[PDB]
Amino acid sequence: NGLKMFLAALSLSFIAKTLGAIIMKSSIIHIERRFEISSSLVGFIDGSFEIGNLLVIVFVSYFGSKLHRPKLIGIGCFIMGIGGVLTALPHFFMGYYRYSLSTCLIEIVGKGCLKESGSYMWIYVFMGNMLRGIGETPIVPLGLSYIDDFAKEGHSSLYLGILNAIAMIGPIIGFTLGSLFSKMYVDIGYVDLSTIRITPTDSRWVGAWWLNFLVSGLFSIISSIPFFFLPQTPTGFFQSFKSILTNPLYVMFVLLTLLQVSSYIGAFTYVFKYVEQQYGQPSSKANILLGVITIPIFASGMFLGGYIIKKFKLNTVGIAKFSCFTAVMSLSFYLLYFFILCENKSVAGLTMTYDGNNPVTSHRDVPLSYCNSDCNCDESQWEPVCGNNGITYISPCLAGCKSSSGNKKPIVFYNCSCLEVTGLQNRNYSAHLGECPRDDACTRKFYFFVAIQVLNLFFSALGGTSHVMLIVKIVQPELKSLALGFHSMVIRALGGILAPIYFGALIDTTCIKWSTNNCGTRGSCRTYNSTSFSRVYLGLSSMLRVSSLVLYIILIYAMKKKY
């Protein structure tokens, strides 16, 4: 079978590598409640995976190429697997877990601090998590380099497309098992599950991070086994690392992809938030289904992109042109989102006054209306109640409603002072709990967003394999492994970490309501002005793509001249 055998082992690693990445996020919430660790330190534990990966990825790629490549992938995979077991050890070494809107009137940090003194189990998760990052280093730079050197004729692109196609399954298997395990209690098998009172919907409930990280670890350990058997074939660092740079086509190409990948990565991280705020439509009904139909199409694009490159005879200049064509199409489709925007959310007490007689320019220092003034209720509390009129209110207490139907279900307030607007005395002022449902005309618009979103992703998916394929050709044959590593480090150090963080900083200015944390001045933002959020999130995302497209035109001219 020649190089085909190697592909099978590599594809298995790709499923394992992606599985490790998704699992940490799918269980991160459970870990915090279980270890009685401070919220601040939590980001740090999540960060542990990234630092391990970034620190060793550039060094290993250059050094790794000289050494045999099949085995190395194996050592790293194997290390990853040990980390997975290492990450979940605490559960086996810790005792049994211990549990411990309104009508108008008319300590966690301390626990962590105690734990911090001397030695605590939170260090174990961090250590183990870092091991996964170290283990990841030789899966893409060393592995991808091997396929290119020994591929026959122009077949390398097609093989890469297949691996990505297989790689997409990783998250799929990971959400099934990941969520399924969450339904299982953390000490399953140890404690009699008939006495545990907390429920999977309960805040207290702690998920099985130990089985969540055990399956990934076991999967990674088993995945390594084929590699060891495989045959080898079917001042040095500083000098070489410099040569990767001062290579006009290559240097701008890495900056070019940092900007484009950041836009895509940034968009993916906040798309659910954007969809929820702009169209009211929740991800609860969206992500649950749209997140599915999407996987095969995204996977289909990756394979098709690889196939298109393989079938046609494409040179290095040709590949770039094809990559640019996807980018032009992606941006044009991306630019279409601005046209399809619903009207701004109307909330009493923020965009407009509680009475609703006239709008207020600034949400801050909003003077309470007469209906609002009669009831003395806290401004900070948030409880979106939808009135008969259709105007959202900050809280039922703020609305002036003093009656409830019982605790059985959202109690349509018997009367609401603000809701019963002048001219409709007969009409009821009762309100229903939950964010006001968006108007029927707007819902139709939503679908337009989702249809283009799937379509845009597919076009992005078509060119997704191109970035990796293009990079190998421009750089000299000797440094292929290193070039990918430097590019991989740059994409996952800035695109991976900086993009969401600066997006959040930029996005927050638009936000109009701040939830009050016990310690933090601002913990979460309840609602964002829709036009401001749309203009800023899409605009920043689009601006990056426009810059990305501009680089391609400059690059194409440069590439054509050299070749």
Ligand X SMILES: *[C@@H]1O[C@H](CO)[C@@H](O[C@@H]2O[C@H](CO)[C@@H](O)[C@H](O)[C@H]2NC(C)=O)[C@H](O)[C@H]1NC(C)=O
Ligand Y SMILES: *[C@@H]1O[C@H](CO)[C@@H](O)[C@H](O)[C@H]1NC(C)=O
Q: Which of 468, 470, 512, 551 binds ligand 30B (CB under 6 A)?
A: 468
What residue 466 binds from ligand Y, ligand X, ligand 30B, none (CB within 5 to 8 A, per partner kind)? none
Q: Which is nearer to ligand 30B, 13 or 278 (CB)?
A: 13
Q: Which of 19, 140, 418, 483 binds ligand 30B (CB under 6 A)?
A: 140
Q: Which is nearer to ligand X, 316 or 404 (CB)?
A: 404
Cβ atoms of residues 464 and 314 within 8 Å: no
In angstroms, the CA 537 to CA 340 distance is 14
What is the pattern of x (binds ligand X, CB under 6 A) and - over residues 428-467? x-x-------------------------------------
- Virtual torsion, Cα 245, 248, 253, 259, nearest 10 deg: 90
Q: Does 346 bind ligand Y (CB under 6 A)?
A: no
Q: Which is nearer to ligand Y, 416 or 499 (CB)?
A: 416
Q: Does 158 bind ligand 30B (CB under 6 A)?
A: no
In angstroms, the CA 215 to CA 19 distance is 10
Element (H, E) at 11: helix 3-35
Query: First and final CA of the chain: distance in angstroms?
Result: 35
Beta bridge partners of 385: 393, 433
Q: Which is nearer to ligand X, 404 or 415 (CB)?
A: 415
Q: Does 247 bind ligand X (CB under 6 A)?
A: no
CA distances 527 to 205, 383, 435, Å, are 27, 11, 10
Tokens of 457: 């992703």
Q: For 351, which DSSP code? A: T
Q: Does 388 bind ligand X (CB under 6 A)?
A: no
Q: Does 502 bind ligand X (CB under 6 A)?
A: no
The two beta strands, 392-393 and 385-387, are antiparallel
Query: What are the start-end ranges of the H helices in 366-498?
Result: 370-374, 396-399, 440-474, 480-490
Instruction: Look at the alpha carbons of 426, 432, 438, 443 in this order and tell me if their dihedral is positive or negative.
Output: negative
Q: Does 18 bind ligand 30B (CB under 6 A)?
A: yes
- Virtual torsion, Cα 247, 250, 251, 252, nearest 10 deg: 120
Q: Which is nearer to ligand Y, 287 or 403 (CB)?
A: 403
Q: Which residue is nearest to ligand Y (CB)?
A: 428
* C-alpha closest to that of 160 among 141, 138, 171, 144: 144
Q: Which residues lie closer than 8 Å to 224 by C-beta, 6 or more apart? A: 13, 74, 77, 78, 81
Residues 190-249 that bind ligand 30B (CB under 6 A): none
Q: Please, what is the minimum distance in Å from the beta carbon of residue 287 to ligand 30B? A: 7
What residue 468 binds from ligand Y, ligand 30B, ligand X, none (CB within 5 to 8 A, per partner kind)? ligand 30B
Q: Please, what is the minimum distance in Å from the beta carbon of residue 354 to ligand X? A: 19
Q: Please, what is the minimum distance in Å from the beta carbon of residue 66 to ligand 30B? A: 23
Q: Please, what is the minimum distance in Å from the beta carbon of residue 418 to ligand X? A: 14
Q: Does 415 bind ligand Y (CB under 6 A)?
A: no
What is the pattern of x (binds ligand X, CB under 6 A) and - over residues 412-431? --xx------------x-x-
Q: Does 404 bind ligand Y (CB under 6 A)?
A: no
Residues 273-332 that bind ligand 30B (CB under 6 A): 291, 294-295, 298
Tokens of 138: 């030789």
* # residues contacting ligand Y (CB under 6 A): 2
Q: Which is nearer to ligand X, 121 or 421 (CB)?
A: 421
Q: Please, what is the minimum distance in Å from the beta carbon of residue 430 to ligand X? A: 6
What residue 415 binds from ligand 30B, ligand X, ligand Y, none (CB within 5 to 8 A, per partner kind)? ligand X
Q: Please, what is the minimum distance in Å from the beta carbon of residue 502 to ligand 30B? A: 16
Element (H, E) at 433: strand 431-433
Q: Please, what is the minimum distance in Å from the beta carbon of residue 210 to ligand Y? A: 50
Q: Residue 189: helix, strand or coil by DSSP?
A: coil
- Interface stretch with ligand 30B, choices 164-172, 373-381, 412-420, 521-529 (CB under 6 A): 164-172
* C-alpha closest to that of 148 among 76, 65, 220, 63: 65
Q: Which residues lie closer than 8 Å to 299 by C-beta, 6 or more apart? A: 164, 165, 168, 169, 461
Cβ atoms of residues 345 and 530 within 8 Å: yes
What residue 414 binds from ligand Y, ligand 30B, ligand X, none (CB within 5 to 8 A, per partner kind)? ligand X
* # residues contacting ligand X (CB under 6 A): 4
Q: Please, what is the minimum distance in Å from the beta carbon of residue 412 to ligand X? A: 9
For the chain, what is the radius of gyration of the CA atoms? Answer: 27
Q: For 378, which DSSP code? A: -
Q: Does 167 bind ligand 30B (CB under 6 A)?
A: yes
Tokens of 169: 């399954």
Q: Please, what is the minimum distance in Å from the beta carbon of residue 429 to ligand Y? A: 9
Q: Which of 300, 428, 516, 542 binds ligand Y (CB under 6 A)?
A: 428
In angstroms, the CA 190 to CA 179 distance is 21
One DSSP character per residue, 470-496 reads HHHHHS-GGGHHHHHHHHHHHIIIIII
Q: Does 542 bind ligand X (CB under 6 A)?
A: no
In angstroms, the CA 470 to CA 523 distance is 43
Q: Which of 56, 265, 267, 489 binds ligand 30B (CB under 6 A)?
A: 265
* # residues contacting ligand 30B (CB under 6 A): 17
- Interface stretch with ligand 30B, choices 14-22, 416-424, 438-446, 536-544 (CB under 6 A): 14-22
Q: Which of 470, 491, 499, 511 binds ligand 30B (CB under 6 A)?
A: 491
Structural gaps in the chain: residues followed by a C–N separation over 2.5 Å: 100, 106, 234
Q: Residue 31: helix, strand or coil by DSSP?
A: helix
Q: Please, what is the minimum distance in Å from the beta carbon of residue 101 to ligand Y? A: 19
CA distances 511 to 195, 284, 363, 528, Å, are 43, 22, 11, 4
**Contact set with ligand 30B (CB under 6 A):** 18, 21-22, 140, 164, 167, 171, 264-265, 268, 291, 294-295, 298, 468, 491-492
* Sites of contact with ligand Y (CB under 6 A): 428, 430
Binding site for ligand X (CB under 6 A): 414-415, 428, 430
